[PDB]
Each structure stands twice: as structure tokens, then as C-alpha cells.
């Protein structure tokens, strides 16, 4: 469009207290390894090469994927589901779309598999394939089973199995949250589960008499000739944990380990410092030092006990010298720092490696190949961005309001710290009341703040509006003299969010008062994701001053 | 070549009415079958007016009139215009929440106060001198929470009571809620700053962690002020409780006997089960006797609700300090005695039906029955009534999965045992065109049963949408020689979709499917199954 808004730069600054208080020594790295909304981690290995994937729901693209040689220094190589033929979330609810993924390398045929559930596009349970994740992946192959959290296991004899969560057979459900682990034989030439090979291997969980919730996230491992089934149990919230079973046969019977769970923060004191909660949904791999490691998700709530940055990806070393794997210190409070594997230096945030700790990301929009952390919601960023020849992000304003279950012209960045600032310079002259551009903080189309520049009657106004249950209310408004680009900032200090603007570039004026991050939490908004910070443009603005 | 639905027949066949035939001077409970939640009632003279919540249905707040509490005439919807109701993009569980209707004798004016989570409205009130004609645009009120209600004292002084959350950081437990009262400025139609006061904290007994104290109503009897509230949430723990005070703003004291309306303690294996009873509102009947309307559900054999929360009524004894719902703590009976001297005329002379009725729609009037609604947008946007009868539906380029108005004429499921049959005259041009029947909890939980064209041939398709993911269950090639009849039949949780090319023999497409995704228990939310005459030009089903 002519006169479309131009965001000339962005600065995202993280300022979390835990990192300032626990500076790294050489040979240490911070946990979580993926800060912000990177849930349901799954990991696999080919030779020296590790690949890590996470769920993504309605975000576009889907299933972010990271590569590492050492489990500390990760390079985001893209997204597994990065084409509209693989990811059909145009109209998808904020809590539907792409659920937990599992990634597995099959050494028998030298093929990588990513198996997941996509509640969109008619996909359901799907698998995509690649010989080389750096080349991308196939279109999805639909798989003939229901439920969530599929995982694929390749036995030494080349035989293949898919385990997944499912419900109990119709009418046998004993309580709310009563779930089942089901296994199939998988035909590797057909890419399909084999009819008549399904079998329930876990009913309920470790101890059915305690009514375990949502036994899920199954993975099968083979070690010392035996078969291990590791699962999440308790649901991905306050009761999250990881449990383990063992069998002599891929299809059971599986017996729970006497010590269970093997990973959890759910029993720990609710007032601890540097709190890590909801820990579970793990996946094991052999590390570069011969040691095992497990990735898993957890949250780091703020001072009001809520999560605003979603479920994040953690890692812990694993001792598997005996019958059952032990998450090292996986049942006591998580520490901020871990020792790097033997002989690896921490290079996070350098040389294209994903950052960690308290970093400052300065985005000047000087290349068409935008950082992979810039995403869309429901639709691809390439539909509304242009990188100007001399730098700067021009956003085509879609006639789509932030409240619509439709792709908006908003370039989003996951909130990755409980204390952060996100500042942008906006060059923009709105022409009528329907035009707005600025910053948005989004849990969903129904739960968000919009902080932006609009024009009404003769004047330009900065507006701050709050959407709750899909109902937008204007919180505060200010007439501004738009004589030059305006800078806009959102600053979060735990649950305290401040929206401020600067016409002189130095002094940021608070618009209204500090507002609560409550609608930016999973606890209030519901769902499966974190706060997304967005460079928003619309030609369907409904705010009036 | 738009699809023409030439006829619809809706038939209810619930066993409870067959087993309990009416005698003279009897009528069936609920008085509004199907999704008519959060009832509120008021009176002017001999004229009763009854309203219900409606969420994202269009139009909003259906409103009924009666002279006798038995024979009701739907007179329209309070939130009738797109200037009053802005649910175009609204989630299935947002939109219009509980309404309260109150006639003010002091200024001869009707008020309807509600919460609309859409269009920037929030808590709103509309006014009318004559509900038969219509109401004002919404007046926005400066408070948060839900379930507002307006009370007019003897001296004309006015109060708004509503549900709210506890003070920021005061929250004791999940579900901890508060009843708050304001003085209301009747000249400016606004709550008066600084007059807000919490009058109930939590519920009858805060030490029992009561959840979602809500639906507050204030009544004045014998000089004392009564606050009647729902407690326990609108699900399995629903109930109604009562408090008393000497003053409008408290302190309010709970009655020793509480709750006074509930089915939550009753045996889970009872027959003709009524559950989730609460959210009541009292009125003086033509009897001189009091009555209370309230919502409840009637689950099927799987223990699920597919027809939503319905409107019930009970006689109320208020000869002593506190109102008593007559038999409101024992299992609900299918039949009640009419107030003294009123005969049952339900389903006749334009009165709303009840029992097991047969609704035959021939689309031979431009004045379409008020039970035909849209979801998110008005029906007038996509319907034309043909000259010699028939409903022509303009197919919108909108899929059933979108949070947008679709071209679908919807009818609430009103029975656990029912059939809905239509005659479809339609020749689809491409894969993108489909017309037929849909059963909808929401855009994310529905069945679509429709006629499609793919390659050179016509197909009937049955597709299931769960969590916004559509899967094709079954397909049949059909010779489209003449119009086709489509039926969905529900027998509790058993739903059968069948088509007839000869008009007599209906062939099942696929197997019977579960109504689980048509229940509130599975799909979540606040509403019932909607049965729709659907057309689209953005069909995504492929054979």
C-alpha cells in the first residue's frame, strides 16, 4: 500500500533477575535452553547432529526446529511445517493447530521423521519425512489413528511402531482425564499404521487407582535388550511429571518402575525462588559425551503465580547406568545453571547461535531474510512484509481486526523474559479512523492489548485498548503531534505492563497507567501458548477516542 | 442456481411426554425446550415478559410474552439490530450473557440489563416503553463482571447488582466471586461513582469455598430486602440461595435453609433427570401466587446435554420470611398444574409449542418464524422466500469452520429424541459448493451432511469437525434426477444422517455417529446443538 506503516527498528531487551544473579562461569549454560513459548520438546540425533523441535498451535510457520552439535549451542534452522501445504491454520483456534511433535531419525533407512497432530486442514495425526532437515520436509502423510502425542520408534530389526495417547474405548472411561497409551506397528514402505496391530499398553498411568490424569507424550526407547515407555503424566499444568515403564516386548505388558515419577516440580514448595513448575513431557537422547540427556517443558511463573511466556524447553543430564533412567536432580528445585557437556564452550547468542540469558536483539530490517523468531499468527509473514531497499519493515495493513480468527498483518516475537522491553520506531501517517499501526501483546484474538497510532477527526491519537473475552475497551488515549517518527514501547516487569510513547526519542510517556499482564497469561486466557509481541497494522481498526 | 430448501419438518419424540400425557389444567416443565438459558421475568399489570441469554446467536435475547405463565408468545428479540448486537466475529462462548428484564412502575419504563462480550459493549442496558415494538440502542454501564440486574425501590431509588471478581489479590480460591451493588442514576442511566459496595463475599458459607455466586436479584417484601443468587456455577453444582437485609446495600445475612432450589444432591441414576438447576428469578403470578423461572438441563443416556440449558418454572411459597420453591429440592416432575383457571394452549394460536410437537415449515410467508435464527449474523442476509413458497439460501463464500457469519438457517434442537428433515432442490456447480444439513455446537464441533459436486458426479457427504479439524466420514454418489430429502435423526447420543432420492426410503450415510461433539460436555461452552440449513461456496470436503 502507499503510505503503509514503516517500522524502522526494533529493540527487544531481556532483563530477568535470575541471570543477573547467577552469572555464568566458563563451562556453564542456562536452563531453559529455549526461553519463551517452545513447548513439547522432542529431540533426535544422527551421528554428531542433534535436532530439536517444539509445538506451535496456530503460529505460522509451525514446529520450530533447532540444530546443535553439543546440546548447548543451538541454531534455529527454520520450521518443519513451513509451507501452507503443510500448515493450514488460516482459520484455526488459538489452542488448536499443531500439537506436540516428535522427531526421530531412523538409521535403518537413513530417514528423519516428524510425527505430530495438526487440528486444522483435515490433517489430524500426520508424519513428514526428510533425509536432511536442512532441505526441509515432505508434505504431510495422514496417519490412521486418533488422539495426540504420536511418537515413532524403530527397533534394531528395522521394525517400526507408533505410540500415541488416545481415549479409552467408548464407555470405559473411569474418570475425567482417564487416558490410554496405544501402540501400532508402522509400515515403513506404506507410511501407515498397520490395521489390526493396535494394542493398549498403558491404561490410565502408573497407578490407575490414583486416577492419573492424561498419561501422554509416550516415547519408546530400547536399552540392554529391554523396551522402555516414558510418558508425561498429570497434565501439562500444575501436576505435570514424567513416568517410566519397562517391558520385554515392544507391545507390552509394560510394568511401571517402582520409583515414579522420575521428573517433576509438582511436590516442591510453592514459595521457592527461581520457581520452575509444570515440568514434564520429556524426550531422551545420548549426548556428545556418552551421557544421556532429556529435554522437557516447564514454566517459570511471575510474582502473581501466572505464566506469560508459555512453556519453555529445559534440559537435564540423565543417568542410565542401571535399570531405569534418573533425571539428575530432576526431583529437587531446578537450578538456573548447568555444566556444559565435557569440553563444550558456551557460545549462545554468538555466530548465529540462538541466544540465552539477558540478551538485546536489535532488528534494523536490513535483509529480506528475516530472523526466524519473527512469525505470523495463522498466516505467513511473507503475505504482509516488505523490506525497504534502505532498511525498514513496511507492513501492508490488512483489513483484519486483531479480534478476528483470521491472519492479521502483525509481525510477532515471542515474549522470552518475565522482565523485558520491546521498543520500535514507527513512521506512519494514518488517514482515517480505520487505520491503526503500533504494538500489540497477544495471548489470542480474545485476550490482548493494542497500543497504536490512529487518526480521528483532525488529530492523531495514541490509543491503548484492552481485549478481554473478545470485547475491546479503550483504556486511555492521547492526542499527539505527529511531526516525525514516533517510538513505541511495551515494558513488562512480571505482571506489570507499561505502554509508552516518545515523540522526541528519549522521553517515553506512559499512556494511561500500568496495566496487568493477567490477560497475557495462560492462567487467564486459557490455551497452550505465551504472550506474542507484535508489530501490528490494520485497515479495520474499531477503536474510537 | 442457489439451493432451495422447499420444506422442513422438525419432530420431537421425547419419551417423557409420551409417558406423561397432560390432563386439563396441566402443563409441561421446562416451558422453553432447548437452548434458552439464564431466564429472567418481569410483569407490567397482567403482562409477563421473559428473556434468555443467547451468546453468538443472531438475534439476541429472545423475548416471550404471556398473560398466564403457561402460554407464551415469542414477540421477537430484545437485541434485534446490528446496532445492538455485534457478534460478527464473536466466539461461540462470548457474546450475550445472562439478561435481566425489569419493569419500573415509577417511570413506566422497561429495562433489560446484560453483558455483551462483543462490540465494546460489556455491561449494557436498553430501555423500552413497549417491548412489543422494540428497544433502545445499548447504554454502556461503568462496571465489570456479569449477571447484572436492576432494582427499583419504593421511593424510585435505583440499584444495579452484579457479579464481580474479588479485589485484585484478595482471591481466596478458583471460583471465588463477589456480589456488588451500585446506586443507579435513573436520569442519566449510569451507576454513580463511589456508591459501589460488596454485599456478598463468596456465597452463603465462605468457609465451604462456594464458587460463582452470581445471578443476583434484589426483591422487596414486607419492608425487607432479599438477595437471591445462583451458587455453585451453572454446571453440576448449580443451586439458588437467598439472603436478607434491612437495607438495599446490606449487610445481607444468608437464610439458615440454603440452597432453596437445586437438583445437585439427587441420585445420579434417577429417571427424567433434571440437572444443573439454578439462576432463578421470581415474579407474582396471576394467581397472587409467586413463581420462579430458572435454568436446568435434561441430559441424555450418556449423561450429556445436547440441547443446552432450558427454561423451567416452579410455584413459590413466600408466606413466611423466605421464599420456598415448591418441591424445588426433590426430583423435578414433568407436569405442573396451571395457575388457577388457565387452560393449556401451547402450540396453538401462535403460542410457543411444548411437549412432542411437529413443526412443518413450508416457507410460504416472508414473516419467518422467530425460531429460525442465524449464528453471528442476521438471517435476512442470506435468505429469500420464493414467490410460490420455498427458502432460497444465498451461499456465502464462508466455511462452517470460520468464526464468521455463514449462510445457515438454524433451529435449536429442542428434544433429546428428534428428527429434522428437509427437501433440497440444488445442483452444485463445483467442488466448492455444498448445501445440506449441519448440526453445530460451534465452528469447531459440528457435523455437515450435504450435497457436493466433484469431477462429473454428485456426492452426498458426511463430515465431522472436532477441534476445528474436519474429517470425511462417508460419501455416496447420487443420481441427482429430482430434489433430495435430507434427515438428521437424534436418539439421545445416537445421530443418524440419511438421504432419500425417492422421498420415502431414507438411506443411512455411514453409520450412526455419536452426539458427543454436539454436547456442551465435550465442546465446552454455553449453548445447545443448532440444526441448520447450510449452504457454502467455500466447501473444503473432497471425496
TrEMBL record, chain B:
Top enzyme category: hydrolase
Domain of life of the source: Bacteria
Site feature: Important for catalytic activity, responsible for pKa modulation of the active site Glu and correct orientation of both the proton donor and substrate: 147
Keyword terms of this UniProt record: Carbohydrate metabolism, Glycosidase, Hydrolase, Polysaccharide degradation, Signal, Xylan degradation
Keyword Hydrolase: yes
Catalytically driven reaction(s): Endohydrolysis of (1->4)-beta-D-xylosidic linkages in xylans
Family the UniProt entry places it in: Belongs to the glycosyl hydrolase 43 family. Belongs to the glycosyl hydrolase 10 (cellulase F) family.
Name of the protein described by the UniProt record: Beta-xylanase
Annotated organism of origin: Bacteroides intestinalis
Shown residues in whole-protein numbering: 40 to 582 of 919
